[PDB]
Structure formats: structure tokens, C-alpha cells
Amino acid sequence: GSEQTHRAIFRFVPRHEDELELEVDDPLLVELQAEDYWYEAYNMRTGARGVFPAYYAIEVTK
Amino acid sequence: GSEQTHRAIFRFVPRHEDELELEVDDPLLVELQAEDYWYEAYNMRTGARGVFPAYYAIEVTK
Known part of the structure; x- marks a missing residue:
């Protein structure tokens, strides 16, 4: 119950405290697709x- | 030497004060391509x- 929704395709190294670090192909569970085009989620690998x-x-x- | 170097291909709405807002097709002059995969630039449109x-x-x- 409650599974993967997305997959990271580009390396993302945070510059800000609220950001989620991403490594290519990381499995993701996106909670919200904010209006400002930012995704709020859990990185299922880390x-x-x-x-x-x-x-x-x-x-x-x- | 303020010629265009890049062009934005995705919409980017800042969530942090140090970020540069981007509209698809915005011509850009990237001053720095940082090691953490973030670009420091000037938006030639705005x-x-x-x-x-x-x-x-x-x-x-x-």
C-alpha cells in the first residue's frame, strides 16, 4: 500500500536544506506536484x- | 563578451532567493557551471x- 510513482533521470545535488538529493534512476514516491513546478517526495533508495x-x-x- | 551561451528548455519557478526564474526558450549567459550541477547565470530576457x-x-x- 503506497508505492513508487516516479523515477529520477538527472543527477541533483542539493544547494538548499529542503531539497532531496537525487542519483540517476532513483525510485521515487512523489507526495505532491506543487504549482511552482517542484516535486515533494521520498527517495525510496536513500x-x-x-x-x-x-x-x-x-x-x-x- | 556577453553573448548567449545557453537556452532554457524547462519552466523553472524559484523556491529559493538565489535562484533564477526561467521560461521555456529564455536565452542565457551562463557564467559558471558549478561542480554540484547548478548553473550560475544571467537571463538575457529579464x-x-x-x-x-x-x-x-x-x-x-x-
Whole structure:
């Protein structure tokens, strides 16, 4: 119950405290697709939670 | 030497004060391509300066 929703496609190294670090192909569970084009999610590989630029991830087919 | 170096390909709405807002197709002059995958640049359309995620722009070969 509650599974992967997206996948990171680009390396994202945070510059800000609220951001989620991403490594290519990281499995993601996106909680919100904010209006300002930022995604709020959990990185299923690292377990960390944070935000990142929307275009850094693609949708995974349920 | 203030010629265009890149062009934004994705919409980027800042969440942090040091970021540079981007609209698809904005011509950019990237001053620094930082090691943490963030670009420091000048938006030639708005005249604003700031940083943004590297993968949000492509390099012009003109």
C-alpha cells in the first residue's frame, strides 16, 4: 500500500536544506506536484524526503 | 563578451532567493557551471541573475 510513482533521470545535488538529493534512476514516491513546478517526495533508495525540480523525474506506470 | 551561451528548455519557478526564474526558450549567459550541477547565470530576457539546475538548459553551438 503506497508505492513508487516516479523515477529520477538527472543527477541533483542539493544547494538548499529542503531539497532531496537525487542519483540517476532513483525510485521515487512523489507526495505532491506543487504549482511552482517542484516535486515533494521520498527517495525510496536513500529513504530521504525533500523537494526537487519537476523535470528531474519521469512518471512510472502503476 | 556577453553573448548567449545557453537556452532554457524547462519552466523553472524559484523556491529559493538565489535562484533564477526561467521560461521555456529564455536565452542565457551562463557564467559558471558549478561542480554540484547548478548553473550560475544571467537571463538575457529579464536581465535577472541567479542559479538554476543544470539540466534545465542546453548549450548553444552557434
